[PDB]
Nucleic acid binder design. Sequence first.
RNA 1: GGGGCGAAAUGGCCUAGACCAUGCCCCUUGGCAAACCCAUUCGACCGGGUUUGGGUCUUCUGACCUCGUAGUCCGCGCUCAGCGGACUUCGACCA
Lengths: 50, 127, 127, 127
Amino acid sequence: SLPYWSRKITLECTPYPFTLRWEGGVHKDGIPDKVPHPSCDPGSELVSYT
Amino acid sequence: SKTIVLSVGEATRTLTEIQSTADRQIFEEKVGPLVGRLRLTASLRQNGAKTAYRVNLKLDQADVVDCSTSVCGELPKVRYTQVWSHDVTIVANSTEASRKSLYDLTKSLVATSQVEDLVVNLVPLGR
Amino acid sequence: SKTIVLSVGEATRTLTEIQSTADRQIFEEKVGPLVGRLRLTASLRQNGAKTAYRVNLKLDQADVVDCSTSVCGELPKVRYTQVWSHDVTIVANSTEASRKSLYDLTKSLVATSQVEDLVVNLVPLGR
Amino acid sequence: SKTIVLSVGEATRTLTEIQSTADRQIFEEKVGPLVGRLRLTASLRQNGAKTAYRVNLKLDQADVVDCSTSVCGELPKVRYTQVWSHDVTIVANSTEASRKSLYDLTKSLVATSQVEDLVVNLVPLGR
RNA sequence: GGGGCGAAAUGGCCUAGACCAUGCCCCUUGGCAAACCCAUUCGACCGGGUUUGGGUCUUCUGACCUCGUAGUCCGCGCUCAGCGGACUUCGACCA
């Protein structure tokens, strides 16, 4: 038998992608259709966003 | 040879290995008279088809009496004999944590005051 | 022994001589698991009445699979086996220039893109 | 591999080991055309019931001819073949001095001028 | 009972030969090594009965401990454990 030495070290992680979403818009005075494109048409604008 | 030191509280007793054998280990206490003293028998073996094991531990101690202090003529004679054997049946593929917990529970049950009362006052264990 | 270095593009593989014999030379690749790896068999002989010669070159490589990473018990098991033998029948009294031209033509046919497509897409050679 | 250098007087010939095997060692001379050159076959074995041994040494050399220097078309063709085998039957439990004396006598008989005349002029040995 | 033999001991037959009579050759299988049980001087005392005896995971194929049996290259070096180590096979209550 003979002498010997060594060492080791490692670091790693697993990848995993995912997605998040959210939409909205301006609240209007009595507009029952608030969509990305408000179906109604009162008198002002609704910017919305998705 | 192989020496074992036991602390009783104020003095230390020494047991010496006398019959070194694999299937039977005989330890004897060396204090004065070798006949009628403290002896310990240890044995280790297997069982069945290489499954578990078997450990046996016995401790004997016979009291002696003598009349040479007053009476003209009386050799040291043994009186009674006490036998305290054991039996350990622990399988190889077990659990170290479970074995440690069992040993701790056994040590606690031995060191408790209930077994001491059961031994001394001969009162059944139930406190 | 005898070491052979093969360049795949980004790494270098090393094959070591294992079974040194005249009529059968066995080279084996040393990377990790020796069973189910890259092996090469070489043979050289004569023919008839000391006219020509015969050279045989075979290359085998069997893939292995293992489940010890997830399943709690499966030894490395071989899957399929690939055999790629050769046959060289070149007479002694030939021509060095002709042999060099034949070797160059074989190298060009091996390095061409038609044999690669025939191997991969299993499409018959004909471009 | 194993190289053997032979001095003819003005040039040195080199024989290379080609078929490395215990029961048959084949040495070939490397000069030019491998076919029809100098070959040497060596063999070593035992005999009977572990008593003595048996050594065989054969030396062959076939001359070649070629007409490509003048004639349009003629591959190198072998002409005659010469066979010079040997047979050594020396027991193990012998004598080193006797073996050395026998080897010296054989060397003297080989280097003498009588065997040379017997080989060249085909005159029976008797001077 | 099941077989063998004319050898081998002799007698018929007995250049030779192949069969006969008593007549002689074997099987009546064998072994487990441990643990526990009785009535009592309310154990000494010999004898009997029960649970185990290469072993588990899916003892289904097939593998995971162990070895036994072989064949093959083998190292004269590479690996943290190291090492002398590799691959393929059949068996595993005992004569």
